Write a protein that binds this ligand. Structure first.
Ligand code: A3P
Length: 288
């Protein structure tokens, strides 16, 4: 009941996800698999619906079969009573969509050997941090988040579930130079979802009619995804995720961080950030 984190190979993880790593050594990847990789709260559920909808040929009826966590297995998941992501995985048919937030230090090597295709979504660190703070509150398996200010301090030293945002985004960027990785930016998806859905289609080697594409742009919108109980996580026990404290689908905005970040916090973050992202051509947008 709100246990602390357990560290493994330098990554802080939720108690259960760490345990789940045991059985996960048994996981065998297929060359037709597709891995969805992101640092938490960077748009995983967004791109999962996009991808599942593509995989279902656009049929919103086939997408309603089960919640997105039953449809896109969560590689390292485990909970009391709720079946592990590995358990779920036994029933999931090929081509499979898989989700993870594991850094490379922990990624099943099966996945890199099998040349598995990666769709990676990155989001600006300020928005991620805010999103993560609210998530910590509602997602009961997380430690106590404490105050925004303290939580932000942790976030800068990567002392939060899954560790440092900064390393996560650079390492998977680097990986994209020697591995098939489509590296997406949440803010581009905000800017122009259609442009971004087209690039995914191209990447996944599929082709769909203009009508179907536009149909997807809408059913993958924040507002549609908020109403859809197969994607908003409301079918889970309130003891596990308490939407009354904070909804999973909270705002879905680029730039909203500015209503949480104080000026002092903003100034300290920018200074810290310039150092951490020094020798990197990664370029983020904070707004619009
Ligand atoms: N279709 C969509 N369009 C835009 N944002 C979405 C979305 N579906 C979910 N989100 C937002 O993405 C974040 C969760 O990401 P993840 O899927 O990685 O956990 C939350 O951000 P906010 O808390 O900033 O609103 C959530 O509201």
């Amino acid at each position: 009941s709100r246990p602390p984190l357990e560290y493994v190979k330098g990554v802080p993880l939720i108690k259960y996800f760490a345990e789940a790593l045991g059985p996960l050594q048994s996981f065998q990847a297929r060359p037709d698999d597709l891995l969805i990789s992101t640092y938490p709260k960077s748009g995983t559920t967004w791109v999962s619906q996009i991808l599942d909808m593509i995989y279902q040929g656009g049929d919103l009826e086939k997408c309603h079969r089960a919640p997105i966590f039953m449809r896109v297995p969560f590689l390292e998941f485990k909970a009391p009573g709720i079946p592990s992501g590995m358990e779920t995985l036994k029933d999931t048919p090929a081509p499979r969509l898989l989700k993870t937030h594991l850094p490379l230090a922990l990624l099943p090597q099966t996945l890199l050997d099998q040349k598995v295709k990666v769709v990676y979504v990155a989001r600006n660190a300020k928005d991620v941090a805010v999103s993560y703070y609210h998530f910590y509150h509602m997602a009961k398996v997380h430690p106590e988040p404490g105050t925004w200010d303290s939580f932000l301090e942790k976030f800068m030293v990567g002392e939060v579930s899954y560790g440092s945002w900064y390393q996560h985004v650079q390492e998977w960027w680097e990986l994209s130079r020697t591995h098939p990785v489509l590296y997406l930016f949440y803010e581009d998806m905000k800017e122009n979802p259609k442009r971004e859905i087209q690039k995914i289609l191209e990447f996944v080697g599929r082709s769909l009619p203009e009508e179907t594409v536009d149909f997807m742009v809408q059913h993958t919108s924040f507002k549609e995804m908020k109403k859809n109980p197969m994607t908003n996580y409301t079918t889970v026990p309130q003891e596990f995720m308490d939407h009354s404290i904070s909804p999973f689908m909270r705002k879905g905005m680029a730039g909203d961080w500015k209503t949480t970040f104080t000026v002092a916090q903003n100034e300290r973050f920018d200074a810290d950030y310039a150092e951490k992202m020094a020798g990197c051509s990664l370029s983020f947008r904070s707004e619009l």
